[PDB]
Design a protein around this ligand. Structure first.
Ligand SMILES: *[C@@H]1O[C@H](CO[C@@H]2O[C@@H](C)[C@@H](O)[C@@H](O)[C@@H]2O)[C@@H](O[C@@H]2O[C@H](CO)[C@@H](O[C@@H]3O[C@H](CO)[C@@H](O)[C@H](O)[C@@H]3O)[C@H](O)[C@H]2NC(C)=O)[C@H](O)[C@H]1NC(C)=O
Ligand SMILES: *[C@@H]1O[C@H](CO[C@@H]2O[C@@H](C)[C@@H](O)[C@@H](O)[C@@H]2O)[C@@H](O)[C@H](O)[C@H]1NC(C)=O
Ligand SMILES: *[C@@H]1O[C@H](CO)[C@@H](O)[C@H](O)[C@H]1NC(C)=O
Lengths: 213, 212, 469
């Protein structure tokens, strides 16, 4: 199958910026290349087909170029709607897509406000303990959370989730959950989440002592 | 006007089959081919195959022998059946109008969940505030299948609300959190209740979040 | 000197109008104009006619008529929205050379409100304007290597042309700048040929000569001084060529800063030729849904008078158009066949023709298919029989499975019996079609809680059909 290699994988830009996304085919695909825009929870939308042909109802700020193996998509002046995922597709042989390019809003650095939540007494009664660490409204997306249970760092007992970039302030939020059994939770005292971000000179540790309130 | 409307979300056990429908409107259905494209959570787009206007089919090599694409000329409906389902078949399934060199019209997608898990209602636990602004929330734990809807004060509280994407646990159940950042002064006057809905199990829970 | 009709130095027409520029001479007359395919050229013994039914702003330019063995008219097509006809968007000169930016004004009435803009205002630039030629940047400096636009004042508002990019090259030392036209030549014994070897320099002291197979030719040189450069041109005219004229022609130029050389090969042939070939086998086999490009290489002399791609193949005759080409004595013709459908299998013929005759190359395209399986219950001579039909290319094999319970696929645990039919009855085996095979399974008694699956395989894939009564 023909591989479609997209560059970059991620792009940060501001409203008004000119943005270029490239795509390379593992073999010659003539001009049988299309560009799709996809926003979360929505289906993809056709932007360009025949390498440079704009589809009906697509604004003039979107343009396509290329022949053979190297193709480009250009958005000449970014509008707030333009922030989405863009995919290139070849239709010379079995249809294949590029891995995507995420286009997000470039804004000023904002450090996360860290919050830790001990497990509720209602939860502990069922026999499990979920410790939650909240990283509120930060920029850029890149943040790190480490769990510490009595200065012992933890591997494989936590899951994290991130919100989409905020429509208002263009920030991100993260939630990490540490799951232990009631037996395991009561073997230790100090529960801590250690946060690393660009908006921080040194890692922020928010913690609690089990029993103490 | 020019649309393809897909059938609702599906939940299946490994080894079962799923048959997804896709109804055309606004154009001569029999004049264009129909392709099915799938997208796994957090992943890219994967073409599954085409059904031509003549009735013929060309399936993606990876799904050959396991996938069937059909059409119903009378109802302008395209169908896609996928057999011997496995966990990695969990994806959003799209039908799209195949103009050979591009997919111009797309269906809204059909979520297909393949899991050995059974319908289970969630457990809503508070995320009580510690001590300017404070954060409080809810932990919606151990539910199947997706989704859950979460509201704060029955829609009255929207500003500063963050409902995080569901996380799939090793157990096969899902878990999520909804947090909100309110002023510290309001913790002794205002009442905060998170409203959690899980239609698949008919679980409607209203949980009051207060400090310890 | 030839005579032009209309006998005026310049002409102004509106877009849409019919323009007819007729040149008449004692012998043959030759027109040389900037746009095509806009102009329809008709040419006889004494005359040549440039014609158009729909005048476009792109028809604006100077039309020069020459009698080989000069006269000109300037046409202006006054487009109320298009004041500029840009001939080239790329202009390259050396430093201290005058650069012409070919912005052709479509209305002579506009001249005094015309200005050169640098995409926007330039620095210390000396320019003049010509309504016929465009702007000239005098003694081009290295700093003047930028993107310019031409402004025309229409209704008190500035109207810009498409950007013209100026590239001013640094004048470094070295042997004189070389030119050899043509880069390649092919002629039939008895025809005429022109080989022009020229050299330029900023200094008048330099030598230039044309050599044929390392033997210097006695060509008289035409020395000139044009655009801050000295030129020496050697025109080699061969009245009637022969196998003695064939070979390597070298244009050699030298001065106090070196000796330089450029070459061309002149081929002399006994008669017109047309040779067709392909790097690809004419017999092609590809899987359905795959893309394919059918390429033919054409070495021809004189120029081709016609070429096409034809679908001969057994299915619906939708004809190519699809067809693209690159390179003039060599050409590659490519028929693009993206995501091949089953009706696109068959014969594709490429034909080319020139004064030497016609030639064709025919490709045979066979498509591969994974198996498609159908199972039905029938009665052959009173006995109950399960009939399995499997279609695909190459020819598939068949396998029967009987298993406990109602299922889409019989599993190792539920499977009660297996019958293999590696070579079933061949039902249909026509070229550019799927091969259809048939397996019959006589079933004496068929129970309730069971299903009969027929699986078929070939090199491309697998197909299946489970039968539950
Ligand atoms: C592709 O072109 C070929 C050749 O035609 C010539 O070259 C082309 C590049 C163009 O310049 C054409 O204008 C030019 O004619 C076409 O094939 C030829 O077509 C003619 C008419 O269809 C054939 O004539 C017929 O011949 C049979 C006997 O075989 C008679 O019974 C008929 O009465 C009739 O005269 C001719 O044989 C054929 N030539 C060759 C060399 O095969 C071809 O049709 C065209 N393809 C497409 C897609 O248009
Ligand atoms: C059936 O075929 C399988 C696939 O083999 C391919 O298809 C067959 C029809 C031949 O053309 C063969 O040369 C190809 O490689 C085999 O793996 C399988 O063993 C075959 N089954 C039996 C029982 O012969
Ligand atoms: C030398 O000239 C002859 C014709 O006079 C020609 O056939 C031959 O190819 C030339 N040699 C080379 C090396 O091109």
């Amino acid at each position: 199958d023909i591989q479609m290699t997209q560059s970059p994988s991620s792009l940060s830009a501001s409203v008004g910026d000119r943005v270029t996304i490239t795509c390379r085919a593992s073999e010659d695909v003539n001009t049988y290349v299309s560009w799709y825009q996809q926003k979360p929870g929505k289906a993809p939308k056709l932007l360009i087909y025949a390498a440079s042909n704009r589809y009906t109802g697509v604004p003039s700020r979107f343009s396509g170029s290329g022949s053979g193996t190297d193709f480009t998509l250009t958005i000449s002046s970014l509008q707030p709607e333009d922030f989405a995922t863009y995919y290139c597709q070849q239709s010379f042989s079995y249809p294949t897509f590029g891995q995507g390019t995420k286009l997000e809003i470039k804004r000023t650095v904002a450090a996360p406000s860290v919050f830790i939540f001990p497990p509720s007494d209602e939860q502990l009664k069922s026999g499990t303990a979920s410790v939650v660490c909240l990283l509120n409204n930060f920029y850029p997306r890149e943040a790190k959370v480490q769990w510490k249970v009595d200065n012992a760092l933890q591997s494989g007992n936590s899951q994290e989730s991130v919100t989409e970039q905020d429509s208002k302030d263009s920030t991100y939020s993260l939630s990490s959950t540490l799951t232990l059994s009631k037996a395991d939770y009561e073997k230790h005292k100090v529960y801590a989440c250690e946060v690393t971000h660009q908006g921080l000179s040194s890692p922020v540790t928010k913690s609690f002592n089990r029993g103490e309130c | 006007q020019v649309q393809l409307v897909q059938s609702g979300a599906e939940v299946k056990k490994p080894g079962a089959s799923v048959k997804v429908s896709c109804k055309a409107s606004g154009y001569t259905f029999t004049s264009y081919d129909i392709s099915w494209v799938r997208q796994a959570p957090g992943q890219g787009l994967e073409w599954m195959g085409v059904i031509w206007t003549d009735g013929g089919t060309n399936y993606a090599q990876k799904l050959q022998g396991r996938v069937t694409m059909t059409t119903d000329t009378s109802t302008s409906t395209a169908y896609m059946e996928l057999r011997s389902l496995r966990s990695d078949d969990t994806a959003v399934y799209y039908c799209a109008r195949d103009q050979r060199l591009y997919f111009d019209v797309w269906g809204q997608g059909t979520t297909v969940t393949v899991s050995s898990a059974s319908t289970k209602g969630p457990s809503v636990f508070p995320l009580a505030p510690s001590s300017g602004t404070a954060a409080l929330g809810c932990l919606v734990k151990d539910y199947f299948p997706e989704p859950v809807t979460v509201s704060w004060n029955s829609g009255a509280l929207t500003s500063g609300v963050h409902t995080f994407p569901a996380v799939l646990q090793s157990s096969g159940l899902y878990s999520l959190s909804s947090v909100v950042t309110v002023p510290s002064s309001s913790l002794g006057t205002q009442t905060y209740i998170c409203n959690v809905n899980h239609k698949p199990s008919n679980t409607k829970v209203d949980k009051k979040v207060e400090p310890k | 000197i030839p005579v032009i009709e209309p006998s005026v130095p310049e002409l102004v027409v509106k877009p849409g109008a019919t323009v007819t520029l007729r040149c008449v001479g004692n012998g043959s007359v030759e027109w040389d104009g900037p746009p095509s395919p806009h102009w329809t050229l008709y040419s006889d013994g004494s005359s040549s006619i440039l014609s158009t039914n729909n005048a476009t702003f792109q028809n604006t330019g100077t039309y020069r008529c020459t009698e080989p063995g000069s006269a000109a008219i300037h046409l202006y097509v006054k487009d109320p929205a298009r004041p500029w006809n840009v001939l080239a968007q790329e202009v390259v000169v050396f430093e201290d050379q005058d650069a012409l930016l070919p912005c052709l004004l479509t209305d002579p009435v506009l001249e005094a409100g015309v200005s050169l803009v640098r995409v926007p205002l330039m620095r210390h630039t000396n320019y003049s304007f010509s309504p016929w030629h465009g702007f000239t940047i005098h003694r081009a400096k290295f700093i003047q290597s930028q993107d310019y636009q031409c402004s025309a004042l229409m209704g008190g508002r500035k109207v810009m042309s498409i950007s013209i990019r100026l590239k001013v090259q640094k004048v470094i030392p070295g042997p004189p700048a070389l030119t050899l036209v043509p880069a390649e030549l092919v002629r039939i014994r008895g025809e005429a040929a022109q080989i022009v070897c020229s050299a330029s320099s900023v200094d008048v002291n330099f030598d230039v000569f044309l050599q044929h197979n390392n033997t210097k030719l006695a060509i008289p040189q035409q020395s000139d001084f044009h655009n801050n450069r000295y030129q020496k041109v050697l025109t080699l005219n061969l009245d009637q060529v022969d196998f003695q004229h064939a070979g390597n022609y070298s244009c050699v130029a030298s001065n106090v800063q070196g000796k330089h050389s450029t070459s061309m090969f002149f081929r002399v042939v006994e008669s017109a030729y047309l040779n067709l070939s392909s790097e690809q086998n004419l017999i092609q086999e590809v899987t359905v849904g795959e893309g394919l490009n059918l390429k033919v290489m054409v070495e021809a002399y004189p120029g081709l008078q016609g070429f096409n791609w034809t679908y001969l193949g057994p299915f619906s005759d939708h004809q190519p158009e699809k067809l693209a080409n690159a390179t003039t004595y060599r050409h590659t013709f490519t028929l693009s066949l993206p995501r091949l459908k089953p009706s696109e299998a068959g014969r594709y013929s490429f034909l080319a023709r020139n004064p030497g005759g016609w030639r064709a190359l025919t490709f045979e395209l066979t498509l591969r298919y994974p198996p498609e399986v159908s199972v039905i219950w029938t009665f052959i001579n009173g006995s109950g029989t399960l009939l399995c039909a499997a279609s695909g290319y190459p020819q598939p094999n068949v396998t029967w499975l009987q298993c406990s319970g109602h299922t889409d696929r019989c599993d190792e645990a539920q499977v009660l019996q297996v019958w293999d039919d590696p070579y079933p009855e061949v039902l249909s085996q026509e070229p550019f079609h799927k091969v259809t095979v048939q397996s019959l399974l006589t079933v004496e008694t068929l129970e309730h809680n069971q299903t009969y699956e027929c699986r078929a395989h070939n090199s491309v894939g697998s197909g299946s059909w489970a039968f539950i009564p």
